[PDB]
């Protein structure tokens, strides 16, 4: 029915133009394998682009943008056809119309184009889409805001390369309000967008802090939906990869009790990134390590270090190891860590873990040994390590091919097990 659809689409009559356009939309609207290629091969894409022009019938603009939306929803080669037909400037132009139906269709299409690659993401930005897109969040229609939020997230997504910060940072005040939304779907993509923006340099992290986003993010960690918790925790986790001052902001927002709740999540990936987030907090100063302890975060971490899946165990190891670094300044930190039974789970990790985690682990063990040695000139810990079977593990680590694990395992054996 395609050669007749094509001729009908090229008719000078206006209502059969619409009739054919609708028909093209329906066949392109198939969840699995829409006939995008045969539609493209009909050569109708430029004609559909013409129908989005200013002062075309509103219904015709809607149907054409919808058809082009689904062509752009396909492969990159198929999306390229839409882009090469100069559809993007018209998509953006449609955002300025007064029809919420047309505007949501246009912003949906831009979501597919921007979500294709960093090239098309930046291309959409280059066509100055940010200003009309930000204006969409003042709409009376939840679905329009919902779709615009997803498209906005795609404009912030990607680190290779990152989007122009001077452009995407303009969306920060909007996103700051959007995480106070009642719509769950809006909440999800808004948090994803923030996680992308906060996935970068400390200058980017600071900007997120400056618009007072962290406080509401922490609240969203206890949201009923894991679809909200996941990007929220990711965003929070990204922020605490910054310096101690930036991390303290998240702490003051009450992230530590929230992280305690996430450590018992049924979803493993939430438990892992909870461990990851905590680890980048125990990577801070003595007072921040102490705050983690005071939030009763160590006992579930120890158990996860003992029992959880491997890639969760790694992050739990990071957290306890980073916390042990505060033992030189405050020996009670180590004394508490040992008291909570962290020595054996650390020791058992030496035979299974990767060379980076092995080093993480050896770092933790030596810190425990240093404190135990000092707590005599004022080795129980070395005795606990031997009985945990750890003295043997560390000795075996002297046959490790990597330089820094060898000499570290060597010095541990030489200093505390001579």
């Amino acid at each position: 029915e395609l050669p007749q659809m094509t001729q009908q689409l090229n008719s000078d009559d206006m209502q059969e133009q619409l009739s054919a356009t609708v028909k093209f939309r329906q066949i392109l609207s198939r969840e699995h394998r829409p006939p995008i290629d045969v539609v493209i091969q009909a050569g109708v894409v430029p004609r559909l682009v013409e129908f989005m022009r200013e002062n075309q019938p509103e219904m015709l603009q809607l149907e054409a943008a919808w058809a082009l939306t689904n062509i752009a929803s396909g492969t990159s080669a198929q999306t390229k056809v839409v882009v090469d037909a100069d559809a993007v400037p018209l998509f953006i132009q449609l955002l300025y119309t007064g029809s919420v139906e047309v505007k949501e269709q246009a912003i949906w299409a831009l979501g597919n184009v921007a979500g294709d690659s960093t090239d098309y993401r930046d291309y959409v930005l280059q066509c100055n889409a940010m200003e009309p897109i930000l204006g969409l969040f003042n709409s009376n229609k939840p679905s329009l805001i919902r779709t615009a939020t997803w498209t906005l997230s795609n404009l912030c997504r990607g680190k290779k390369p990152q989007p122009d910060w001077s452009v995407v940072s303009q969306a920060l005040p909007t996103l700051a309000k959007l995480i106070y939304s009642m719509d769950t779907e809006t909440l999800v993509d808004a948090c994803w967008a923030i996680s992308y923006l906060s996935d970068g340099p400390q200058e980017a992290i600071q900007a997120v802090i400056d618009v007072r986003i962290p406080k509401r993010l922490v609240e969203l960690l206890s949201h009923e939906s894991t679809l909200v918790q996941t990007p929220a925790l990711r965003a929070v986790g990204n922020i605490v990869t910054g310096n101690d001052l930036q991390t303290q902001v998240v702490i003051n927002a009450g992230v530590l009790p929230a992280l305690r709740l996430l450590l018992s999540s049924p979803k493993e990936n939430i438990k892992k990134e909870a461990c990851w987030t905590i680890s980048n907090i125990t990577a801070g100063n003595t007072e921040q390590i102490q705050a983690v302890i005071d939030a009763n975060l160590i006992p579930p971490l120890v158990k996860l270090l003992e029992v959880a899946e491997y890639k969760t165990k790694k992050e739990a190891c990071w957290a306890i190891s980073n916390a042990s670094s505060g033992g030189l300044q405050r020996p009670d930190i180590i004394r508490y860590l040992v008291s909570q039974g962290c020595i054996k789970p650390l020791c058992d990790l030496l035979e299974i873990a990767d060379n980076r985690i092995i080093e993480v682990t050896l770092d933790a063990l030596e810190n425990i040994l240093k404190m135990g040695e000092a707590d005599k000139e004022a080795n129980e810990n070395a005795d606990f390590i031997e009985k945990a079977g750890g003295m043997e593990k560390i000795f075996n680590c002297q046959q490790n091919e990597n330089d820094k694990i060898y000499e570290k395992a060597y010095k541990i054996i030489e200093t505390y097990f001579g």
Partner: peptide, 19 residues
């Protein structure tokens, strides 16, 4: 010191079909 576990920069296409 801080650390990221991801480090893997994957620009998977993020698209949605409207049906």
């Amino acid at each position: 010191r801080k650390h990221k576990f991801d480090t893997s920069t994957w620009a998977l296409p993020n698209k949605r079909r409207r049906i």
